[PDB]
Amino acid sequence: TTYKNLQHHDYNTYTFLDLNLDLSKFRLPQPSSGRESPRH
Amino acid sequence: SGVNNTKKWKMEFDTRERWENPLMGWASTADPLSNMVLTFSAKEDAIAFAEKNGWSYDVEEKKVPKPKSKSYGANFSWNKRTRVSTK
Amino acid sequence: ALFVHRDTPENNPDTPFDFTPENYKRIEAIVKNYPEGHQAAAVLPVLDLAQRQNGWLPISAMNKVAEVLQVPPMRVYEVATFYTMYNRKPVGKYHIQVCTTTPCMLRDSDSILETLQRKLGIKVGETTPDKLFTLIEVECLGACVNAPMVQINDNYYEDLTPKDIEEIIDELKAGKVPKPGPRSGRFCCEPAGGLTSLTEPPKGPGFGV
Amino acid sequence: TSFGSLKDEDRIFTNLYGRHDWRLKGALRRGDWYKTKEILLKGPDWILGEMKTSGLRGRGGAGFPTGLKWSFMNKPSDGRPKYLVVNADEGEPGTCKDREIMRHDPHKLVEGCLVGGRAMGARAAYIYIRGEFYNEASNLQVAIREAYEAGLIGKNACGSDYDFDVFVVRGAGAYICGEETALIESIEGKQGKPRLKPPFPADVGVFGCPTTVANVETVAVSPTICRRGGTWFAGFGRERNSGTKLFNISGHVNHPCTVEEEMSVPLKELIEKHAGGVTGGWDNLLAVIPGGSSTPLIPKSVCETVLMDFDALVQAQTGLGTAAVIVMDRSTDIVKAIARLIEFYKHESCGQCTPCREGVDWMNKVMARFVKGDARPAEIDSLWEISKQIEGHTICALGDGAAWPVQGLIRHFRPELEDRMQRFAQQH
Amino acid sequence: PSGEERCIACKLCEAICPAQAITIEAEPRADGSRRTTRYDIDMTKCIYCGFCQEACPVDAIVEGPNFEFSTETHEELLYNKEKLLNNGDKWEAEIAANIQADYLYR
Amino acid sequence: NLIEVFVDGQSVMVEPGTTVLQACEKVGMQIPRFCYHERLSVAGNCRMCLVEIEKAPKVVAACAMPVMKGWNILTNSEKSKKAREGVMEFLLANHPLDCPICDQGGECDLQDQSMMFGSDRSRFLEGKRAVEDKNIGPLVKTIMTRCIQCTRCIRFASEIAGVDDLGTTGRGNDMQVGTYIEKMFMSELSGNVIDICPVGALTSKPYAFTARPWETRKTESIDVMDAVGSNIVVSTRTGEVMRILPRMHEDINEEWIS
């Protein structure tokens, strides 16, 4: 019929980072290493 | 990063004085045993050679390298501080 | 590029770079996305977000990313000089980058770069005097079965002619973003006449379990 | 057994050309999240057994046997969490078969991340996308937003007792971050330089934590290898190499397409039946590259009787990676084509090994001299010798993929190089 | 051929000189380049063998075809650097013709 | 916890967690090295160490492999010697020819490996890359044209010097090593970067051009002026103090000096 991916025209340049902002409240509590850094 | 100088024992002398030549600043010396290095294969044979020639010896033992625990899997750890940030 | 810094007054570490508070909330969203152990995983998308904040990534931003994420700045510059998406030269607003490698080239990418040169006035890699378009001869951008393709900013414009350039550039200069997608009668990368697959309507839930 | 049909009921990559509702609530219409709860509650070893009995192999440039590759770590917990990594990078030229499943069904990729991640035993799957794949990453996180709002990922893995995370990690534009370990160092946040393999990624992967690296097909035909096949997927293809493949037919053809078909189909059928024939007919169609860039050439003398198996192309002196059927014709420049391959490898290659720092650049300089012809024919076999000096002498297989079309060009198109040496020997 | 003393302190010409007749202790020139402070050629030593002119990678040391350089006192055959440099400056019209007629042979 | 390892038919019992280099060092055969210092971390970059591993068709690197069980490392084989001559040919493809310029005349670790392990005649007729020199300090003179990108300096500055300043910028032959901005790399232990560097790319600036290591005579001493008491090779030329170098004793100073 007709091509249905219409939102790929409509995505702004901040869109994927904005959905990372939306999904970071949906993410699990991330694993901890016992260390705050590799101390580079 | 070689081994082939470290493999055999050697026998150098006490370094005496080496003054400047008054003509053009050459290394002028009066010690003809200063250029002497003698190769060997064992510490016992080198000590027996120094006893059979009569010079007093200073013997320094062979400083062999201890083999390290070098593993590539420990370069990328989950908790340890030995992570490499270059690659 | 040149892969070294020559401390010019347009690229000194006193150029004005500071994130917005919603950008810093986005930085800690990236930090909470990654695990808390090894939080030097956030060199690439944080500096990519700096590139999305502004192009021509200065050394104040390359020290700002290290200042926020507590990475060494040389370990930041390793990423920012290894990766080809990160622009350190002064680049334009629209930033046309065109493939010239081989499946993407054998259907006529030499002519699309040549008509880009004849339309713009750039030899290989410099800028327009209005700083609108810069051309970078990139190697591969993925989308090759649509056989000519260009990349304006963050969109794919693909399977197109110099006659299609005659509306795409002429609407980019004097208009908005001109419908990112493949031209010349195809929809994504379909057959030019007909369809090979997806001709029957698609299968059911658990079809053939 | 002369298969290669793949009739329209048994398509495995439906919603690929755009139509019929690519989002969630249209993805569940076409078969997604249907028996996934009982798939996860039946057991991870049952999913790995249905991988091994299907005989799914690596759909990237390696061709490693999956099932075995995911049972490299069918391990109990060592303290570290476990991760599944998805090479959403494509990088090899001609290969947007992963871009066409980024669009139009990323929910199958998300379901494959969840099914393959609980099949290995894991916590998160990291879909690492290319830095020029912005709309693809946005469609991926639209599908991740729909799955997390439906409650399919995260503390109820399609309503089960399992916690999972699905991330999108964006790169910044190199093919080498599609490798199995420069993938890992790119996600760890460094230069995209591949690690040495004598520590495997199954023992230490991203962040020190053990990982399984898989391509987009390699995880995305997995959630319908277990709700739909296991023996049906093994019945397609031969015994060593089995399944379906997104064939990517590009270059000098009237219909450039991505057609998903049954693997080990004839290449005559891949030219003529689906993605209709090349310009001119069959006086053309010399110099077909069967895969993307890590496969050597074919001189059209044996190409009429080519089966598309991995070991059959090994017996036909090539490999098969991503299966991008790049077709040249007689109106090409084959030396300019393969010098543009080594120009891609020189302007792309990560710079870690000695025979890819100064070996790939050597092959680029000698083949750029071979374009103009201003060399002598005594260096063709020496450039063959340095191509064989690159091959097994590198860290990753970018040295393999850079020195292999060199070996194809010298193995099949040596008299065209001798003709160009004669053409420059005419001049003065 | 455009000024500029050719010697660049390599020290392979006394590792090949079998009389041990060459001392060439050097410094950076404080101009960015690389030259020698001292040359010493002992003419009361040395073997007249052409080992140095075959080991010189830039052909700075050369053995110009004099033989009329007999001196009366022993000081005057200890050629340091300035005697060698104005010797080659004295004989550059003949040495360069010999090297230009001879460099296909070696 | 011992592994029976064959090195050309030997019977060496080596502990697990080892390398092929640390297996062969008990034999006495030295597999050639540029990227691997003994006291730095393993990072296979230079690819000189390639040996064959008894009839597996891929030659493997001696830095990364643990010897598993009963492997025979054929150190003097046709495939390993072809690998070493090929990797030396590829190292000397884009090496600019400043060996009479260079500080490491006899102390070049790659002159000796090309002299004993590489081929005879290079077939390179194309053109070498040239790298812009840096301004790291008044101690470390960096002519980075002849750098072989072996990353032995950046692991020292990242792991033992702890400065995090030397890392690689770029890719391919355009990958160059050093500070990306004009940074004065001047910490303590910044002179051990020179002796770690097997090439004469970065060398000493006060010992720039004054002597040569075959001409110098190498005596031994202990340090003063810091109370750690390190073993020092004093290399003297004609009764003049020319170099001070570290000397290996694994307690007091393990090939470093300040």
Ligand SMILES: Cc1cc2nc3c(=O)[nH]c(=O)nc-3n(C[C@H](O)[C@H](O)[C@H](O)COP(=O)(O)O)c2cc1C
């Ligand atoms: C040099 C190199 C580059 C690769 N690039 C990609 C890539 O961009 N995309 C991809 O999906 N696989 C890529 N692969 C393949 C995967 O790393 C590998 O095949 C993996 O096992 C996934 O395939 P499988 O699912 O059949 O196991 C690459 C492999 C190599 C060695």
Ligand code: SF4
């Ligand atoms: S083969 Fe090339 S791309 Fe792969 S690790 Fe070596 S230098 Fe990097």
Ligand code: SF4
């Ligand atoms: S005379 Fe020649 S070999 Fe000797 S130091 Fe001078 S330039 Fe080098």
Ligand code: SF4
């Ligand atoms: S010719 Fe004289 S200066 Fe030259 S190496 Fe022979 S003996 Fe020495």
Ligand code: SF4
């Ligand atoms: S480091 Fe390079 S320039 Fe110096 S002697 Fe060795 S090969 Fe020659």
Ligand code: SF4
């Ligand atoms: S400067 Fe020296 S140590 Fe550093 S990468 Fe180059 S050759 Fe290796």
Ligand code: FES
């Ligand atoms: S090579 Fe052109 S984008 Fe693929």
Ligand code: FES
């Ligand atoms: S010595 Fe092993 S790769 Fe360098």
